[PDB]
Amino acid sequence: GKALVIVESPAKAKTINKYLGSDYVVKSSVGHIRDLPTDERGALVNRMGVDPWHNWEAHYEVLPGKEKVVSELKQLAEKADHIYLATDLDREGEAIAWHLREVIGGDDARYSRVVFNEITKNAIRQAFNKPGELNIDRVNAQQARRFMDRVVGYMVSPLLWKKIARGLSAGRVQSVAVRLVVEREREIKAFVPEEFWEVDASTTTPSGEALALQVTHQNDKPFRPVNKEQTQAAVSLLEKARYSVLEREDKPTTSKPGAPFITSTLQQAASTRLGFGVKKTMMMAQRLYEAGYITYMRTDSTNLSQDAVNMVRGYISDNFGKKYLPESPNQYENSQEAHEAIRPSDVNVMAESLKDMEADAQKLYQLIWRQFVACQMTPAKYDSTTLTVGAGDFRLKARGRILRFDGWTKVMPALILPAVNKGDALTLVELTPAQHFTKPPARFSEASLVKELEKRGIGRPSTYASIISTIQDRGYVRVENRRFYAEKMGEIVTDRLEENFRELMNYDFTAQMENSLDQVANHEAEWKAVLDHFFSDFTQQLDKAEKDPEEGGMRPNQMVLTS
Ligand SMILES: Cc1cn([C@H]2C[C@H](O)[C@@H](COP(=O)(O)O)O2)c(=O)[nH]c1=O
Numbered sequence: 001g002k003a004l005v006i007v008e009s010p011a012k013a014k015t016i017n018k019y020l021g022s023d024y025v026v027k028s029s030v031g032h033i034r035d036l037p038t039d040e041r042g043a044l045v046n047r048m049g050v051d052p053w054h055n056w057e058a059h060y061e062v063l064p065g066k067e068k069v070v071s072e073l074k075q076l077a078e079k080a081d082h083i084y085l086a087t088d089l090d091r092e093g094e095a096i097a098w099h100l101r102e103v104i105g106g107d108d109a110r111y112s113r114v115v116f117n118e119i120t121k122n123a124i125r126q127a128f129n130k131p132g133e134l135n136i137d138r139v140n141a142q143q144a145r146r147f148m149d150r151v152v153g154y155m156v157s158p159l160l161w162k163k164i165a166r167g168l169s170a171g172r173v174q175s176v177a178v179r180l181v182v183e184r185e186r187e188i189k190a191f192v193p194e195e196f197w198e199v200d201a202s203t204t205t206p207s208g209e210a211l212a213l214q215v216t217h218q219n220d221k222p223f224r225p226v227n228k229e230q231t232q233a234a235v236s237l238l239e240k241a242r243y244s245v246l247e248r249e250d251k252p253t254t255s256k257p258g259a260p261f262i263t264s265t266l267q268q269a270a271s272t273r274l275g276f277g278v279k280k281t282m283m284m285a286q287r288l289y290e291a292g293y294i295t296y297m298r299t300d301s302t303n304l305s306q307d308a309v310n311m312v313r314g315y316i317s318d319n320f321g322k323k324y325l326p327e328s329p330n331q332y333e334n335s336q337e338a339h340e341a342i343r344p345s346d347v348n349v350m351a352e353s354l355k356d357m358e359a360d361a362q363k364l365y366q367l368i369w370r371q372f373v374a375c376q377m378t379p380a381k382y383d384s385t386t387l388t389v390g391a392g393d394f395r396l397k398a399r400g401r402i403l404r405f406d407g408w409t410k411v412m413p414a415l416i417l418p419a420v421n422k423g424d425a426l427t428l429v430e431l432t433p434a435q436h437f438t439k440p441p442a443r444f445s446e447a448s449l450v451k452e453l454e455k456r457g458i459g460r461p462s463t464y465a466s467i468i469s470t471i472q473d474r475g476y477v478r479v480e481n482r483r484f485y486a487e488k489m490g491e492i493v494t495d496r497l498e499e500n501f502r503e504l505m506n507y508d509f510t511a512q513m514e515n516s517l518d519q520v521a522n523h524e525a526e527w528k529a530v531l532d533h534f535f536s537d538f539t540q541q542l543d544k545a546e547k548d549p550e551e552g553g554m555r556p557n558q559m560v561l562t563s
């Protein structure tokens, strides 16, 4: 007579309830109900909860206090015809659905796995309209990841306690992430600032208009004196030279809006524009999502549904007008790549209209809403001017720009050279030398590290945040003034791992393991075979590391005296 639906949080249960008829009964497991504990060694296998030596047999256990929840689901599941696992759409979500089906038990046919990337009326109806089945491959991909992380963490760390210090930790991806910071910390430590000069000139057009120029070439070669003498010498020539205009290339340019956000880009924009850290951004993104205000916050897809594009184009026509609406929609699909960007669930809901959301949560929505609306508006137009000037053997230039049509920038908050013809004489009024110095590489920010992680194909929309968090409370790196700093212990452990766990620390291999995980999720590889391969390369590394250093083993945090 009735159906039972299960979600992972009360917040998600409340929102989805508003869209499910009387035939359905929503219930939230209130978190993960079951999971792992909080050549061979029964002692090690028990602590890990997985057995690399008996074809990866696992020992999952119902989490503390959640035993009341199981019974809550159990008895509830019997007074129902069908059971719907409406956990989030990601692999982690697929595995949580699995654990739910396992615990409650029952014929596999009593279960369905619904997928949706936003909690709205029409998204909920279609999700339960054409329900799906649990996908064991995605579940196996998720456990594969969980098993190798456990292996690395529980088997490397003990070597580190013995070789380096007690309490240390090792992380499959985390240690690779720390490597990037350590390398960046070193580049900076060895950087040598270099001196170079620049010369500016103030002139007067024939009218009397002021014109500022920068010296670009001398003898047709790029101008860049490296000291104080060279500049004065150049300055001394520029003082007697006759200045004249020799081209006014007036060219029309445009700026295009960015694509709708994906996990990584949201984090960077939120951090750079709103000063939000990765943890903060993802926690608020989640609440907006579970509140039904935005699409799933874990994605690497910039695709937008026809419906979403139709609703926003409508908003653009009504609120901005025809000159802001492109002829055809901007397209940034099918079987693969069938997800969506982070966009509001209803373009007609303004940040100021969010009910149960805090100030910064509304601000994040605004940033998301603006990016979304802008991505579907026309480009902005400018008329760029470039004045090249000649003076003796020198060449100087001045650039200028005038806005002609705001286009997409209209939905963003509210925010020029004189007239001269080729051949006009400019009067020199003043010359101004300026000394500068090459700066060192920028320090990673929480988000810009994720950015670097993404381009190296190391992270994953659903792991970036955890990766940033997990490497901070361990003494390897620290964030000071919102920037990363490598700690001495971070370098100590990093050099050790690169020396005795090369494959594990290699970027390409780490990015490759993500591909391998995708092949599992796509039934192109079998999770256990993939795990056996990983363990094989791992233990060979580990066995070598545990040996005395005189036999090539890991270096202890030594430093001995004359004796
Ligand atoms: C939890 C998790 C999710 N995902 C995601 C992001 C997307 O929502 C989806 C990709 O779809 P797929 O698993 O069918 O290939 O799963 C990963 O790729 N790795 C993970 O570890």
Ligand SMILES: Cc1cn([C@H]2C[C@H](O)[C@@H](COP(=O)(O)O)O2)c(=O)[nH]c1=O
Pocket: 271, 272, 273, 275, 442, 443, 444, 445, 448, 481, 482, 483
């Ligand atoms: C040091 C610092 C930088 N920022 C910046 C400067 C950049 O605009 C942005 C991150 O820059 P990045 O992508 O080059 O790493 O955030 C802050 O917002 N707060 C800070 O405390």
Ligand SMILES: Cc1cn([C@H]2C[C@H](O)[C@@H](COP(=O)(O)O)O2)c(=O)[nH]c1=O
Pocket: 273, 274, 366, 367, 371, 412, 413
């Ligand atoms: C993408 C984009 C965002 N912004 C933003 C994001 C911030 O929410 C906003 C500054 O905050 P404000 O609107 O509250 O004054 O500016 C731009 O100014 N230009 C852009 O091109």
